[PDB]
Every structure is written in C-alpha cells, then in structure tokens.
Design a protein around this ligand. Structure first.
Ligand code: FES
Length: 96
C-alpha cells in the first residue's frame, strides 16, 4: 500500500512513493525520477538496479538471471514494490 522505495541513484538517492500495483519507474517519473530506462517490454540486456533491502516482485521481465537476482539485483522497468525496499539504480554494467 504505497511504500517508501529508495533508489540509490548516482545523483545521491531518490526516496519516493511506489504503489504495490505500479512499476518502480512509472510512478518514479511522476516524482521526477530519471531512472536509466530504455524501453518497457521486458526482453533487454540493460535496465537494472541492486536490491539493497526489502522485497519486491519483478515476475514480469525476461532478462536478469537467478544469479543476478540472488546476488542482489532487479530489473528497473518491470518491478512491483511489495514493501519499503531499498535498491540502487544504474546497474546495467554491474550485472552483465
Ligand atoms: S529497457 Fe527494456 S525492459 Fe528495460
């Protein structure tokens, strides 16, 4: 129910409110968050962030491996915040 998502951006963080039923992008741009997006389809080799804490559901994309997920990564186009989550954005060239 509308959680406090942190995006640790290079800029130096953008904490924002993200609905459990919205993507961590769609509602980010609303606050003004320029995430490193390229598309919204979910068959890419870019567009990721590092899950620091909390849990979220990205069972929608088709890119990040089990390794990357477990290792602490998430796609940044198709992700639903299930609680207060902390993630770092700009992690294309940290997962590949
Ligand atoms: S840029 Fe294509 S799903 Fe993220």
């Amino acid at each position: 129910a509308t959680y406090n998502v942190k995006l640790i951006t290079p800029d130096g963080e953008v904490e924002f409110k993200c609905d459990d039923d919205v993507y961590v992008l769609d509602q980010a741009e609303e606050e003004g968050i320029d995430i490193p997006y390229s598309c919204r389809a979910g068959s890419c080799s870019s567009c990721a962030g590092k899950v620091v804490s909390g849990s979220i559901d990205q069972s929608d994309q088709s890119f990040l491996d089990d390794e990357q997920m477990d290792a602490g990564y998430v796609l940044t186009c198709h992700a639903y915040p299930t609680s207060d989550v902390v993630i770092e954005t700009h992690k294309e060239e940290e997962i590949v």
